[PDB]
Design a protein around this ligand. Structure first.
Ligand SMILES: [Cu+2]
Ligand SMILES: [Cu+2]
Ligand SMILES: [Cu+2]
Ligand SMILES: [Zn+2]
Ligand SMILES: [Zn+2]
Ligand SMILES: [Zn+2]
Ligand SMILES: [Zn+2]
Ligand SMILES: [Zn+2]
Ligand SMILES: [Zn+2]
Ligand SMILES: [Zn+2]
Length: 126
């Protein structure tokens, strides 16, 4: 029973492809949907504009916005109060966005049923 995740992304989003490859390297079964219309996907899942990123995934009913680490997807699965988790933007050093030894600090921000932010994980910058 490997975990399954459905990813929609643009055809020319190479970081997005890198992130999928990090998930498969962690054992996820990934379905890759190339879609030119990510605004439709994010709006369909109620991804708040302020949390947007390069790609939008769905696992077990909850959305996964941006370069969320796999360990944080596992925490997202366990949390009945959260409808999604996001890494907004494209911080360098997040999985699939790695560009050397330096890393932007970033957080994984869960969203609650009623729309509140909730910090799932914090990643210190190097
Ligand atoms: Cu990127
Ligand atoms: Cu990306
Ligand atoms: Cu992406
Ligand atoms: Zn699908
Ligand atoms: Zn679909
Ligand atoms: Zn395009
Ligand atoms: Zn489309
Ligand atoms: Zn556990
Ligand atoms: Zn990589
Ligand atoms: Zn180095």
């Amino acid at each position: 029973e490997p975990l399954a995740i459905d990813v929609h992304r643009d055809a020319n989003c190479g970081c997005c492809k890198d992130w999928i490859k990090h998930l498969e390297a962690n054992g996820f079964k990934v379905t890759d949907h190339v879609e030119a219309d990510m605004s439709a996907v994010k709006s369909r899942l109620g991804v708040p504009y302020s949390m947007g990123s390069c790609h939008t995934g769905v696992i077990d009913g909850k959305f996964v916005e941006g370069h969320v680490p796999a360990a944080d997807i596992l925490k997202l699965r366990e949390r009945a109060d959260l409808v999604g988790a996001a890494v907004p933007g494209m911080p360098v050093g997040s999985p699939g966005m790695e560009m050397g030894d330096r890393q932007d600090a970033y957080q994984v921000v869960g969203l609650t049923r009623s729309g509140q932010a909730s910090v799932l994980a914090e990643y210190p910058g190097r």
